[PDB]
Amino acid sequence: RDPASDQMQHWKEQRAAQKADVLTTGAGNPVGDKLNVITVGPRGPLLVQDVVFTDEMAHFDRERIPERVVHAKGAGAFGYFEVTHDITKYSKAKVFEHIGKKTPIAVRFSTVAGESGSADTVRDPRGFAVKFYTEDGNWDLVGNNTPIFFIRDPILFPSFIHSQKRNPQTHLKDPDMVWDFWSLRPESLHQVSFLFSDRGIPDGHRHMNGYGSHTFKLVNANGEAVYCKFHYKTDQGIKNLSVEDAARLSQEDPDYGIRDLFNAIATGKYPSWTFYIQVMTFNQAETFPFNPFDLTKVWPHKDYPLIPVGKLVLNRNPVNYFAEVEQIAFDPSNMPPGIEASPDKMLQGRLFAYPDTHRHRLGPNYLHIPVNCPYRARVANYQRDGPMCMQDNQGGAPNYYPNSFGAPEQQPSALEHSIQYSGEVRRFNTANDDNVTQVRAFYVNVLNEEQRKRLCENIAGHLKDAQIFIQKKAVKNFTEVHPDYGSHIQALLDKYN
Amino acid sequence: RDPASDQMQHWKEQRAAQKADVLTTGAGNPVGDKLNVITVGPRGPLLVQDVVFTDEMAHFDRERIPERVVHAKGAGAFGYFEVTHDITKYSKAKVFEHIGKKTPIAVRFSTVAGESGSADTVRDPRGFAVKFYTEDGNWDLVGNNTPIFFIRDPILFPSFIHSQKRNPQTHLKDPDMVWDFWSLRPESLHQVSFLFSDRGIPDGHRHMNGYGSHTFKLVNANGEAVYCKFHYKTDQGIKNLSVEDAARLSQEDPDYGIRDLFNAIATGKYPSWTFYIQVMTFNQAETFPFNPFDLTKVWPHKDYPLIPVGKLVLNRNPVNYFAEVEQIAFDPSNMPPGIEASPDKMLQGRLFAYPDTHRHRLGPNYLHIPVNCPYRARVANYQRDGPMCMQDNQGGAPNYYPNSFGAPEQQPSALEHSIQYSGEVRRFNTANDDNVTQVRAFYVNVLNEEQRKRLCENIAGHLKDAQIFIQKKAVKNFTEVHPDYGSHIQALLDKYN
Amino acid sequence: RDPASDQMQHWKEQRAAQKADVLTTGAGNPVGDKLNVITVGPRGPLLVQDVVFTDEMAHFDRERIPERVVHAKGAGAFGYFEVTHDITKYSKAKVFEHIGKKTPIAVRFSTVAGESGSADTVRDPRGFAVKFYTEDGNWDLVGNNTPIFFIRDPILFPSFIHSQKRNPQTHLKDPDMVWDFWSLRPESLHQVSFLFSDRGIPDGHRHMNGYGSHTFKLVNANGEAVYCKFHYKTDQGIKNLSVEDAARLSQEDPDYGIRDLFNAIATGKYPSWTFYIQVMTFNQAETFPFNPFDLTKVWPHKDYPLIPVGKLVLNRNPVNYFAEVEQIAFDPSNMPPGIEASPDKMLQGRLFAYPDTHRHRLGPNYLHIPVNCPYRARVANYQRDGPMCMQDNQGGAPNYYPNSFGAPEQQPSALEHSIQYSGEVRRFNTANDDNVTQVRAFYVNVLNEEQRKRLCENIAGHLKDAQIFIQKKAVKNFTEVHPDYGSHIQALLDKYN
Amino acid sequence: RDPASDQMQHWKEQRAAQKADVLTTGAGNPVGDKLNVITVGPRGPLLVQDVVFTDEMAHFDRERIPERVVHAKGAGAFGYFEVTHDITKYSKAKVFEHIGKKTPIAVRFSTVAGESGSADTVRDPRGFAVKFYTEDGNWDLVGNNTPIFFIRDPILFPSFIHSQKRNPQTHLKDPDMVWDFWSLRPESLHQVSFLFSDRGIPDGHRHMNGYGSHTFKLVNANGEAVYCKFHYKTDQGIKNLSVEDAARLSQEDPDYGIRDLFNAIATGKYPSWTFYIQVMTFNQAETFPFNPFDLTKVWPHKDYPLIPVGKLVLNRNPVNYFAEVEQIAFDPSNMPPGIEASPDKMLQGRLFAYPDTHRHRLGPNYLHIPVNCPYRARVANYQRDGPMCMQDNQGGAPNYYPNSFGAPEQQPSALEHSIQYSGEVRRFNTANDDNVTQVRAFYVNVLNEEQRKRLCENIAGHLKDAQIFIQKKAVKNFTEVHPDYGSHIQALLDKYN
Ligand code: HEM
């Protein structure tokens, strides 16, 4: 059998030649018997003094924590990030200090809309989150398998996710909801085209690219700032499942990506991604034809070539899935000195959203969870007492700042990069921005004829379930992108009806 | 389209001719705009004073509650229970007071081992829980589609569920775990035979029987006690999917049972179950060949014929799934006067387990949730303050008992039925009880030849993945049940290998 | 006896002539007996089937919620806000629509640093929070008995509260911590002078003023904006306890303020506060000698006279303290149209802090708690599912925006007031701002000689416990305010040593 | 100053000669500045990208956990238990293995009815809980400063605590509630007499005795069982405060016991208690004049002399109070092999109540908290996944039992002691048991004349506030105990009225 199937036999084999441990309660008291319960004779009612029973059962009753509101279904792996090129001129980050520096990483792959127990091989954006354990605290590059997203304003994210997920009454997937939202929000045409292309259903997690998707800000030691986009492209090469194969695997193995990643790492075939960046100066940002902080836009490779930085290798499988993969938390706000946020509205929304949801899901002290701890750095601050605190709680150190007792002091070299912003403080409309230019470019330059046909059949296959007026509004947006794109979808929809 | 697909259009149509409501915050403050966020000009960072954004997002971040540790994937419906026969001689329950009495009910169907988002049409025991809103508080008949269970001692339940669910390292379904547990626990042969028969994969929730599965105690007004088993058999008739059809539906519609029940109720075809009971006297219980409180045994129909009581009709679909189906809590401990627990160890374990898990999942005051409230009864007691209390908290009534201020008094007519139990208070072994007699009876009397062949191919198909020694231990147990049963499985396993 | 002592007798008297209600479980099942537990004979162990016991006990085990991180000890009352003057030229708020309009209010009085069960009559700032149930959602004026605060930057608030509260090792009140923080932060001199004056220990909650303390922004129907400060001064007149009387009452009645407010409302003597405002134009704000958004500064009455608006009357006592006072949540972010936030950094910090802590303390759906609900307004939005949801969860309404099914639409008349802000986006130092001018004014104009002497003895009495260097740093700050102020404290400290 | 006051200076002195640590976020990212917030210029609104602010504040908002439902106000200390005598004939416990064996202990002192921040020096039963870190898991002797309690049935405990605590409407202490409950429950006369004697207000925690109060069961290696009562009497001698001194200290130092214990341990004066036991055979238990498992009765010293076992010494103060004292959990169910529960109904109720409340207060995985961990024992079991899990979660070990992969096995030598119990399974009344015999004995043998007078004045002083009929019912119970006892109280009450 494959290494995944032989987990228990491998556990037994690695622990051969030693006697079984003593079965104990949570409090370490040895258990006399855990196959029978205390009764008033052979056919008597259960006793309260059955402390072993009530302890076991009570713990069983509290096993489930809340699933992630998005990217619930996931697969986890560990490894390192190796620097191969010098980008010290761009960033002063300790992760990019010198060439050959290895930083340990934790990675989680996921499907955005799928719940815990849903099929892996489905058409959906794939999450690609990376946690760098840097000497200057954790760095969380929370990325996707796509360089863009559907929307450009973070207030629409809850709406988008509600439309992608189940109907509130019927609890069913509603193409009506999906295509109503997408037809009303035409800035999603670019991401929709990517999603319904061949790379919508990647063959496992090893054969997909990864993108930060946001514009980030790199600051050097001299104090100069530039703009960045992180790319981590697969070294195993892009490889995708057909709709028929994906449909087969959905019933055959709904845990295809978990099994594929576990077997790949277990057999020694360590998957690797090459870390690239694009650089954009402040004058280039001001003279960019589009909004350079727009999440629905990309930076063309001819104007902004990829600059190699390093490689990401995954070599270690999780020991316990719940402890290392279910409980791992990725905060985009976790950025070390040299890396900062850009004015990208979406990124600004993510800075709040993640720590808030982590306090709900995992708990107030979720950063004390071993996988979440910045173990390669020293934490010292005036943050004290919360529920489930598993540290000394910084012992008897003064818990107020400023003080006169040598408590932790602020480091002035870790200040943020200052910038002057113009205009009023109000709500600016971005729905009426360019929605079709880069979509047309992708359609008529990147895709070939058979790829365009497959794209149109995939969209038409999903969109046929929506109401007539929603189909018309969707096809109108596809026609405004390109007339052949719209006409082909419309022809297929007419065939389907 | 089907009624399920037209949920939004039906919502719009029923609310036609009125203007859209004002979009407000949680605190009822009208929202100016919820499509854009407040920025420092068109390309500026997000402001903290964007209260609308942070409120929406914070609520979005806290949407997920923990799924049920078991029976996570479920479908909900509402209706009534109509009494058709007089059983007042057996029980003094207000639910069975007089003929033609309608008690409102809430029902939830489920798959035991499936997570939220797993396929509906899979081989697994189906949950069939019924909540009777009786005038003497709620009655929760938390039943299955099978009259028996796998185990007879409640301390093994967490072990059984862990074996049925994912591997702790790989997070994959492990036939190794499933068949190791089943082979080591041969009292599961009866339930295994039922599970791998044709009724393992019922065609939706309308074409399956329901059983309390436990022995219950009926007490009449005179104070005499008897033993009972609740049966609720389908009026639509038993109907099952083939393995191939089930495998197809798993990828086609993973929400087959939710869609089927919603469409059935929406179109007017109300499904119904006929409520039966078996009665066993205390002398019959003492002279029963087996343990009558053994959950792996049934009461034969020739010795204990079914006595009709009433019918269960489901006529109303849930308005909101989360509010009415996700948050519904069924406590087997919720039993009105006239219905009591028997010495069945499993039932004794369920009396503790359910209220404990409900306090974790839903919260301390989960009985204040509308679907969980005993709205057809008056609650008055000395239970006060907890988190998320949405009552007057019983106002200014004395909160101690006994008192001298006319606070709620105990009703002496609601006392439990007293019984003398013999033997020591210790752990009695029940693993070595009869495990094969009723299994043989079922195999060679109920099933025909083609049903026996399908049963053997289904078991062999699942068991082939297990290690050789586990296959041998499983086949040995099947051989001890019946030599043809064991030999046929072994022949198919040899073919598979 | 006083009305407070006769609560139970009054309950009995108002419910005379009716029989005691039936004692039930949470699930409404009548209790047979709740004075004895089920045992295996007279001297036998307790049974698990004692469902009544385990239900009662389990609810008892979950009674405590987390106390407020600050203002834990509190007293609650209800009444109304009556408009007496027209300020429609300043604000378009429905609370200020027309003269004679009564809005129901909920008020909570509190001590900032005291825990639940601490003494009422102690030297500490008193909280004065008011919840207006306006037709445009709830308005929460979360005020103090002082027009200023200790600090002017919200990042120092956790530090300030940690210094005021117990030592992390010893769990004792530490004057060392208090005076170290106050000596290092000399912008606290103004609030310290107010706190150690006669009005530090007010005689109950009826004899103290209330202030919003922040600069707020009033917007009229025409769209013009001004700046505001809310004052609500006592109609019963300012009245204070001596240090000796306060020290006596601390042991005699630690619940002096709760008893005083309950008896005052119960006997019919309804306390009232007169609602005033100060108005500041944008040109006046730009030409103000100090920062007009500085929380440590006041607006002088000669330059900015008080403008009457209405009166606050408290007429109803809480029915249940836990339900109505412990669980009440005041969000400064809850502001109806016509009232907005100013650039006051402290207010900006409060906009985030309160909803975040409420989700922790009370729970995600804390606005479903009756006292927190905006019951005089209609809530409709795309916020769905959370723990402990006790609404229809907005039934089957579309849960995404924008949509095409007539779901709640944004009201364009409720937009925020736009303003252009100059300067870079960075951290600006405000520690070096004016700290002594208004403190000197208060010392040498408002206070008389005997009031100055009492102020100095109160400060010296508290400060004597601190280390010598902290005493020197504190006295230096008092000397920089005024030489007589510093010299008198120093003389008293030398006497104490 | 005393060592308690010099905590911060001692921290500074022990960490002298090293530079202050770098101020970091929770994620270990160095903080640039934590005195100012990011604004849009000097007088601009706060930015969302202020990650340092929102992290600090969010953690501050989640500092409070629920206080203990009882014994909220507490003081903690650590040390060891040294065996001085051989009791191996009675118990096979590893804590009592051999003479001179030192087991580390954690102790918490407390006041039963006081909230967090209430006065220490008040008339109330004092908690005396001891956590033995035995090699066979933790042993929690959760005791009081009194050998008895008020009630003998655990279903009345929530009622008793509600009566002792605040009124549900007024939130005030109600002598009406206290004396109504005590007058209706005359089995409290013994504990009431002890409480209103001189030992009601002990001088700190070092000058009070400690009792298990329950009958426990000692089992030896041979398998013989006896009954036990644990006594731990002070080596510093019994010492009490007068009512006047206690009333003074209530305002002077409400944290008298915390300061006293901290200073005692800090100066080197380690307090010690001598561990005694009483032994009762099964024949003696059957021929005892009273119920030997009755919590309101004692075992007379003449019939059952004290047998020395060892001494309890407290030598170490807590480093952090929240981590070591607030979060410590004592489970009476935590009993190592050789120590078991008796049929005492109260003890049976405590076996359920404590683990249930700990899961609410601290969380499901509260035994992972360092102070709660059985660090001197190895925990291995099939308890997996819960919220806030900070272990490997037992890695990849099989999570079901029984199994075939060498997972932890049950130890047959740790079985419970079996006993045959007679009588029916129902609710037996114990309210009508003897309530006056041992109370009379205590009154007329132990107390002298001036002690009897003080006892009567203390009761009369508290009882005068109750209604006339409650005073009559209380005095009647005191008269039934002894006519002089009743007559003296009545005379003082008549004087008070
Ligand atoms: C940066 C500044 C401040 C922060 C971070 C802050 C934070 C908090 C927090 C977390 C609470 C607990 C609320 C709960 O859990 O129920 C609270 C309560 C309170 N705060 Fe503040 N606060 C600030 C400034 C002020 C100011 C300036 C005032 C008055 C002028 C004030 C008055 C109050 C009052 C009255 C309460 C109690 C509310 C109640 O009755 O429930 N606070 N504050």
Coordinates of N, CA and C and ligand atoms in Angstrom, one line a residue, chain C residues 68-71 108 110 127-129 142-144 149 154 157 211-214 295 328 330 346 350 353-354 357-358 361, chain D residues 57 60-61, ligand 1:
Chain C
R68 N -16.4 43.2 33.0 CA -15.8 44.3 32.1 C -14.3 44.5 32.5
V69 N -13.4 44.5 31.5 CA -12.0 44.8 31.8 C -11.8 46.1 32.6
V70 N -12.7 47.0 32.4 CA -12.7 48.3 33.2 C -14.2 48.6 33.4
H71 N -14.5 49.3 34.5 CA -15.9 49.7 35.0 C -16.6 48.4 35.3
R108 N -25.8 53.3 32.9 CA -25.0 52.5 33.8 C -23.9 53.4 34.5
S110 N -20.6 53.5 37.3 CA -19.5 52.6 37.5 C -18.3 53.3 38.1
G127 N -17.9 56.3 35.9 CA -18.5 56.1 34.5 C -19.9 56.6 34.5
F128 N -20.3 57.2 33.4 CA -21.7 57.7 33.2 C -22.1 57.4 31.8
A129 N -22.5 56.2 31.5 CA -22.9 55.8 30.1 C -24.4 55.9 29.9
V142 N -21.1 57.3 25.9 CA -20.3 56.6 27.0 C -19.4 57.6 27.7
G143 N -19.9 58.2 28.8 CA -19.2 59.4 29.4 C -18.6 59.1 30.8
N144 N -18.0 60.1 31.3 CA -17.4 60.1 32.7 C -18.0 61.2 33.5
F149 N -9.7 63.3 30.5 CA -9.1 62.0 30.9 C -7.6 62.2 31.2
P154 N -4.5 56.7 22.5 CA -5.2 55.5 23.0 C -4.3 54.2 23.1
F157 N -3.7 53.5 26.9 CA -4.8 53.1 27.7 C -4.6 51.8 28.4
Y211 N -20.1 64.0 31.5 CA -19.5 64.5 30.3 C -19.2 63.5 29.2
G212 N -19.5 63.7 28.0 CA -19.0 63.0 26.8 C -17.5 63.0 26.8
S213 N -16.9 64.2 27.2 CA -15.4 64.4 27.3 C -14.7 64.5 26.0
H214 N -15.2 63.9 24.9 CA -14.7 64.0 23.5 C -15.3 65.2 22.8
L295 N -8.1 65.4 24.7 CA -9.0 64.9 25.7 C -8.6 65.4 27.1
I328 N -25.6 44.7 29.6 CA -25.8 45.9 28.8 C -24.4 46.3 28.2
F330 N -22.3 49.2 25.8 CA -22.3 50.6 25.3 C -21.2 50.7 24.2
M346 N -8.3 59.5 20.9 CA -8.8 58.6 22.0 C -10.2 58.0 21.5
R350 N -11.5 54.1 20.7 CA -12.8 53.6 21.4 C -13.7 53.0 20.3
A353 N -12.4 49.5 20.1 CA -12.2 48.7 21.3 C -13.5 48.1 21.8
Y354 N -14.6 48.8 21.8 CA -15.8 48.4 22.5 C -16.5 47.2 21.8
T357 N -14.5 43.9 22.5 CA -14.6 43.4 23.9 C -16.0 42.8 24.1
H358 N -17.0 43.4 23.5 CA -18.4 43.0 23.7 C -18.6 41.6 23.1
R361 N -16.9 39.3 25.7 CA -17.5 39.2 27.0 C -18.9 38.6 26.9
Chain D
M57 N -4.7 46.3 21.8 CA -6.0 46.7 22.3 C -6.9 45.4 22.3
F60 N -6.0 43.3 25.1 CA -6.5 44.0 26.3 C -8.0 43.7 26.5
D61 N -8.7 43.7 25.4 CA -10.2 43.5 25.4 C -10.6 42.0 25.8
Ligands
HEM1 C1 -8.5 54.9 24.4 C2 -9.5 55.1 25.3 C3 -10.4 54.0 25.8 C4 -10.4 52.7 25.7 C5 -9.5 51.8 24.9 C6 -11.5 52.2 26.5 C7 -11.9 50.9 26.5 C8 -13.0 50.4 27.3 C9 -13.3 49.0 27.4 C10 -12.6 47.9 26.7 C11 -14.4 49.0 28.2 C12 -15.2 47.7 28.7 C13 -16.6 47.7 28.1 C14 -17.2 46.3 28.3 O1 -16.5 45.3 28.2 O2 -18.4 46.3 28.6 C15 -14.7 50.3 28.6 C16 -15.8 50.7 29.5 C17 -16.1 52.0 29.7 N1 -15.4 53.1 29.3 FE1 -13.8 53.1 28.3 N2 -12.1 53.3 27.1 C18 -11.5 54.4 26.7 C19 -11.8 55.7 27.1 C20 -12.8 56.1 27.9 C21 -13.3 57.4 28.1 C22 -12.5 58.7 27.5 C23 -14.5 57.4 28.8 C24 -15.3 58.5 29.2 C25 -15.2 59.8 28.9 C26 -14.7 56.0 29.0 C27 -15.8 55.5 29.7 C28 -16.1 54.1 29.8 C29 -17.3 53.7 30.6 C30 -18.3 54.6 31.2 C31 -17.3 52.4 30.5 C32 -18.3 51.4 31.1 C33 -19.4 51.2 30.1 C34 -20.5 50.4 30.8 O3 -21.2 51.0 31.7 O4 -20.7 49.2 30.6 N3 -13.7 55.2 28.4 N4 -13.8 51.2 28.0

